[PDB]
Amino acid sequence: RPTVRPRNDVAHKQLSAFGEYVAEILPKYVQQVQVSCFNELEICIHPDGVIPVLTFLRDHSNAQFKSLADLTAVDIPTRQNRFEIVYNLLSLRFNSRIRVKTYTDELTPIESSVPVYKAANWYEREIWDMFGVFFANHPDLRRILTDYGFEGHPFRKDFPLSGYVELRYDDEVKRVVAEPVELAQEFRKFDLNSPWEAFPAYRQPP
Amino acid sequence: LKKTTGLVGLAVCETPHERLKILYTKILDVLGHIPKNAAYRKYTEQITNEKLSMVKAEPDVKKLEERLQGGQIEEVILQAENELSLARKMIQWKPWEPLVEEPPASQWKWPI
Amino acid sequence: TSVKPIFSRDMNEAKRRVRELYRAWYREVPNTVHLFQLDISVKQGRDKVREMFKKNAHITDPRVVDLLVIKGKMELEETIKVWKQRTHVMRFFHETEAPRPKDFLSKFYVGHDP
Amino acid sequence: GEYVVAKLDDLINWARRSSLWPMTFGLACCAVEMMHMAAPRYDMDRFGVVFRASPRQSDVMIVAGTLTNKMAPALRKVYDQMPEPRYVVSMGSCANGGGYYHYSYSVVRGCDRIVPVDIYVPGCPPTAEALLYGILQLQKKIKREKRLRIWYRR
Amino acid sequence: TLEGIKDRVLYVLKLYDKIDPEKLSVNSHFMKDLGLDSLDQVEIIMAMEDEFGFEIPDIDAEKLMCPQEIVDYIAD
Amino acid sequence: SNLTLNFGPQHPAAHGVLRLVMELSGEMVRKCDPHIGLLHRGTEKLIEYKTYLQALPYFDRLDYVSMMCNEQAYSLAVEKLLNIRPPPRAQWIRVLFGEITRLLNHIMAVTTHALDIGAMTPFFWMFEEREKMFEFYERVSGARMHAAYVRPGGVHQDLPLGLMDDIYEFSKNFSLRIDELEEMLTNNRIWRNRTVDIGIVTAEDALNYGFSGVMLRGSGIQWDLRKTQPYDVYDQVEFDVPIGSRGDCYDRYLCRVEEMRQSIRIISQCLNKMPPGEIKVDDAKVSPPKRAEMKTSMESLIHHFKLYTEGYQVPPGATYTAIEAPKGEFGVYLVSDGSSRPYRCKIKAPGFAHLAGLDKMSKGHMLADVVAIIGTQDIVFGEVDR
Amino acid sequence: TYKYVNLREPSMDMKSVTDRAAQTLLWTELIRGLGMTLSYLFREPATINYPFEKGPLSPRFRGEHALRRYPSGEERCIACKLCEAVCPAQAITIEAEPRADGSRRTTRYDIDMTKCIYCGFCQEACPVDAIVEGPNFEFSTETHEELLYNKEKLLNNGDKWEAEIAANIQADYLYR
Numbered sequence A: 001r002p003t004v005r006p007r008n009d010v011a012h013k014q015l016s017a018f019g020e021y022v023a024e025i026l027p028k029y030v031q032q033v034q035v036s037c038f039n040e041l042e043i044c045i046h047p048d049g050v051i052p053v054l055t056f057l058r059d060h061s062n063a064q065f066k067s068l069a070d071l072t073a074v075d076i077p078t079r080q081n082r083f084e085i086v087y088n089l090l091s092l093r094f095n096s097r098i099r100v101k102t103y104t105d106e107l108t109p110i111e112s113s114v115p116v117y118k119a120a121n122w123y124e125r126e127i128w129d130m131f132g133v134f135f136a137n138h139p140d141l142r143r144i145l146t147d148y149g150f151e152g153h154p155f156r157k158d159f160p161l162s163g164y165v166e167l168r169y170d171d172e173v174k175r176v177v178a179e180p181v182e183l184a185q186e187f188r189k190f191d192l193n194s195p196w197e198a199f200p201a202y203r204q205p206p
Numbered sequence B: 001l002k003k004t005t006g007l008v009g010l011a012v013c014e015t016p017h018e019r020l021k022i023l024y025t026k027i028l029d030v031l032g033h034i035p036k037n038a039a040y041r042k043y044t045e046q047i048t049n050e051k052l053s054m055v056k057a058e059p060d061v062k063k064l065e066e067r068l069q070g071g072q073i074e075e076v077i078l079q080a081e082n083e084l085s086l087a088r089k090m091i092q093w094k095p096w097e098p099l100v101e102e103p104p105a106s107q108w109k110w111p112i
Numbered sequence C: 001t002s003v004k005p006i007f008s009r010d011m012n013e014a015k016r017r018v019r020e021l022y023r024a025w026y027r028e029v030p031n032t033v034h035l036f037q038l039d040i041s042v043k044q045g046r047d048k049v050r051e052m053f054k055k056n057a058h059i060t061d062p063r064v065v066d067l068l069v070i071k072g073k074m075e076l077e078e079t080i081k082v083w084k085q086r087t088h089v090m091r092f093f094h095e096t097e098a099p100r101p102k103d104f105l106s107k108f109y110v111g112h113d114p
Numbered sequence D: 001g002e003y004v005v006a007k008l009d010d011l012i013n014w015a016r017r018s019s020l021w022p023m024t025f026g027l028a029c030c031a032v033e034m035m036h037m038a039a040p041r042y043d044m045d046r047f048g049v050v051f052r053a054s055p056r057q058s059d060v061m062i063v064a065g066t067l068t069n070k071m072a073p074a075l076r077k078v079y080d081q082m083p084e085p086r087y088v089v090s091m092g093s094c095a096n097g098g099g100y101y102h103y104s105y106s107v108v109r110g111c112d113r114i115v116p117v118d119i120y121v122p123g124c125p126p127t128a129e130a131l132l133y134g135i136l137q138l139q140k141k142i143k144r145e146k147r148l149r150i151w152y153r154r
Numbered sequence E: 001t002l003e004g005i006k007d008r009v010l011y012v013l014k015l016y017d018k019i020d021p022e023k024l025s026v027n028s029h030f031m032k033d034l035g036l037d038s039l040d041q042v043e044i045i046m047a048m049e050d051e052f053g054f055e056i057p058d059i060d061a062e063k064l065m066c067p068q069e070i071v072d073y074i075a076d
Numbered sequence F: 001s002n003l004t005l006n007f008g009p010q011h012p013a014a015h016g017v018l019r020l021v022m023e024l025s026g027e028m029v030r031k032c033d034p035h036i037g038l039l040h041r042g043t044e045k046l047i048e049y050k051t052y053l054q055a056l057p058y059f060d061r062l063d064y065v066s067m068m069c070n071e072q073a074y075s076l077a078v079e080k081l082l083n084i085r086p087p088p089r090a091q092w093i094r095v096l097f098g099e100i101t102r103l104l105n106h107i108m109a110v111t112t113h114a115l116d117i118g119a120m121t122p123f124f125w126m127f128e129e130r131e132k133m134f135e136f137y138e139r140v141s142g143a144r145m146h147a148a149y150v151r152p153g154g155v156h157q158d159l160p161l162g163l164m165d166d167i168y169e170f171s172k173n174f175s176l177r178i179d180e181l182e183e184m185l186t187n188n189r190i191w192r193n194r195t196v197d198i199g200i201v202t203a204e205d206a207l208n209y210g211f212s213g214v215m216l217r218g219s220g221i222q223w224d225l226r227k228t229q230p231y232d233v234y235d236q237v238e239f240d241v242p243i244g245s246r247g248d249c250y251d252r253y254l255c256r257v258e259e260m261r262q263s264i265r266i267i268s269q270c271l272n273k274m275p276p277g278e279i280k281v282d283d284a285k286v287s288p289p290k291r292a293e294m295k296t297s298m299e300s301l302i303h304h305f306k307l308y309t310e311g312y313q314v315p316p317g318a319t320y321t322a323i324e325a326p327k328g329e330f331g332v333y334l335v336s337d338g339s340s341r342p343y344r345c346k347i348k349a350p351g352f353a354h355l356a357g358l359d360k361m362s363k364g365h366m367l368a369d370v371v372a373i374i375g376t377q378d379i380v381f382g383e384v385d386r
Numbered sequence G: 001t002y003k004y005v006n007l008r009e010p011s012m013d014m015k016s017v018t019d020r021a022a023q024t025l026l027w028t029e030l031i032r033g034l035g036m037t038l039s040y041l042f043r044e045p046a047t048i049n050y051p052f053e054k055g056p057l058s059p060r061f062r063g064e065h066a067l068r069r070y071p072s073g074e075e076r077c078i079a080c081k082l083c084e085a086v087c088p089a090q091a092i093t094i095e096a097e098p099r100a101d102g103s104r105r106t107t108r109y110d111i112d113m114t115k116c117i118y119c120g121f122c123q124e125a126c127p128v129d130a131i132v133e134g135p136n137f138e139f140s141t142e143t144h145e146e147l148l149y150n151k152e153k154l155l156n157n158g159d160k161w162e163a164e165i166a167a168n169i170q171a172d173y174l175y176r
């Protein structure tokens, strides 16, 4: 149908079979495997498995996920382990992508993946900077995006959008100073969610 | 013999068939120290034995390359080297063991 | 309650790392005042350092202490390597912010905040 | 006396506005349209606005892009090192008042919190022609100055 | 020169403002007697480090809670 | 010792300000420490307070030299979570303006690369061409740069009558303009002395450091997302991927110049193969209806009202979608919670990994070779900092 | 499909060697570059005589905002607040109440022109063509406050530019 995205059945079967393959080989760490309706394979693993799972996917002959495309974190405050660490990998040999996910909380360190992918060095610094997730055995873990001395982790869901402090130049002390934030116009929160369900296929149980 | 692999930092190999035979044999030797029921051993042994058989039958380097479907023969050598490195690490990690810990009840539920 | 540690396995291990951080901060203040040509005294800078350590004295969670030490070391490096500018080092003192009323009557006069 | 001072301001105002050497902070997007003003279609050099300068040889600073809290101290320091007379042109919504990142924790809500601004050029980005209009508006502002007339009447 | 050790050690503590000298007796405990805090002791150990030109790791520094112990450590 | 490269050149330049903390011994670079964040504006957190349409303009302002390519990446990610398909004419328009954008980026990449090295004349010749391509942007969208033209569902408006002929006129003469650029640089011994064997990166190191685009292809890696993982109608156009052999700045410079020629080759096919039809998905629950429908039909007005207030809801899910942007692989990890605002939007900027490799690529080079190496990576700190 | 950008082997016959030696010693490839810049000196420049000449624009150009009227003179805006809802920058602030004749009209209509991204989403969202981005782009000011438009300023912009705004809309409304 002209307006509907076509389904690719062959890639869904292929990625499912490879998902079982990885689950069978790494049972010590793999907690869940799923493939989305648009054919993206996700491996959910225990956080202890970061290095073994990423090394297997990089080096194994049937995996060869040589390129770390992205590494990010998602904050879900309702979860006991609020932070979800997402690794997106690319295999040039098999022209395929895979997503590997794990989790942690505010006080639990994750193992640095710099040994597996040098690309991860700055990504982990950004996750530390913006979410406050510590990576153990990182060559140089420090803020990368925020200002020096910045307090808090702005990408956390409970960090306010405009922050807590703002900058201006003060003539009395002849330097830029930081003061508690005041807004001439407050950001206008909108309630946009319709009170009618949109997607029955995703309904949660009562 | 080629003049270049085409990939910067990847050198041509003068004796690709012999180098591959060494590497696949070393991999199978290392795979012997993994428990027989580990899926890693069974699967890695299967693919290694398929590649080794292809190296035995095909003497022409060009023709062998279309069989292995792994790029330049030097890329195939490099991959065997990585597999051998991986197999050693799996002996320490032992990923064939039961899942270390279950996630909390709603760890992987989306949407919340 | 069995949790993965950061560095310290108990509070006595953590308190050691805290004291090393204090020594490093204590010794750097005279250099910080000079390199950044601050107009505070070395005693003023050290008093602020004590103030910052003091307001975390109630913590009894070794993991939280490790993060506090980890964050404190990063701040020291930014200062030692001169990544901070003069403006950054002086933000600990809030020189341009008028004192905030603390008692009930003073807060009642100014507005509605408690 | 009165006549001379009037003609003398006319001279120095002509010289300063006919030779406006800019320092551009190419902070972000707006620096692209700033480059298009130097490109052959508009050729800012033909107005006397040279291509390259140096902070310590510049007369006008063009804040062309978003100014973050991290960048704020460095921009103020460059402004403080400019020899006088010095002017600031605020180019685009970000530099004007924060623009599309106005409500961000890490963005200065207008560069006029850090430095005094002579001209505000609206747009996101302002077209190269819009910036050129703002630069020629600053020349008219300089043409209106009366430094010696005021000085002579002190 | 051992007896000099006492003078230097007891001299450095005099210069430290938090210790009223009327209560500064060589055997006085920094915490119980002089009423100092843990970080005050760290400042003293750092003050001794400059006077005697050597370092004192935290392992040993936490066992010096009165002037006499400092004297014992330095001589040894 | 220890230095700090200036924020930017003395001449006008548009790629952002960098604080580069350098370790040197004699003339040699011992360490490069890029201190970024000077253009970090919290885009990803802002996107969480916007509907999916309201967030689209944030993508023009990332790699703000490749505006429509960034839009296309975001649109493909949203269209994938929506499970819809943009109409074929929109796909051809998106590939057509994708290649026009690639020309815009490569002109900026190559001529500012020469301008920083001191070869400044080609900059002026080639931004007269960029000025004419800005006119194409403004004629379809009304804006010279930040068009907000490509959207989930297709494109906002259809090409004005007479635009395609003008694009043909521009494309007719452009190869000669590339030829004049090559006359100044390609065989110039000074240009080669500044670029040949500078910033060599091995194929394996490039992959492990997370490089993409020309940073991979300069080292001989045969990878182009338009070929291997095609999107829109890129599988219906013919072009060659330029491949380097020595992995240095000079080979990457030649790759970009050849990619410009292939973009002209692709644009030629888009002009000849442009099909008729609608420009946005005929699905008024995603794409707003025509203004004439909105003013006559009750259903159309309701859908116009809801699309421009609440916005369309995206089924819950997460996708990583990437395209072959002019600067390398540009991707978005977009998380939907079922509402009309994205839950999380991570932006994968190709220059983020590339600038992380500057320390590696500059080992054992001169202080002025760092200028060339940041040049060959083509860094825009809008996308590096978000 | 791929191609090599730099995979040529130089010819080592004495003639080719001598050709490269002449290029090195006589700078011939440097002379060739001088010819190209010389050819430009005698070309006609691309510069236009601003402000007497202007860059070409199209009817779609997104410039300064304006509030429009019906031919009767009644305001088109009915305070529906769709533009305020869609504005990516939250640059629009609207208040409304029943007019003395009961008409649904705004009492406040502000656009912070230093927040605006000049994206045109408001004029797409407007159901009555009330708010538009006009063709004016030469409105830089000397103060920040002059870029905080209220309803009087925007209505005056509509009365000022309507002659051209209406023509631009007439030329493009069939693409919308």
Ligand code: SF4
Binding pocket: D028, D029, D030, D064, D065, D066, D091, D092, D093, D094, D095, D099, D100, D123, D124, D125, D126, F061, F064
């Ligand atoms: S004002 Fe617009 S074009 Fe200029 S830097 Fe900000 S977002 Fe980019």
Ligand code: SF4
Binding pocket: G083, G086, G087, G088, G089, G090, G091, G092, G111, G115, G116, G117, G118, G119, G120, G121, G122, G123, G133
């Ligand atoms: S042009 Fe865009 S940013 Fe400006 S007022 Fe209209 S909707 Fe808001």
Ligand code: SF4
Binding pocket: G076, G077, G078, G079, G080, G081, G082, G083, G084, G094, G122, G125, G126, G127, G128, G129, G130, G131
């Ligand atoms: S300008 Fe248009 S969209 Fe905005 S409130 Fe008025 S009628 Fe509604």
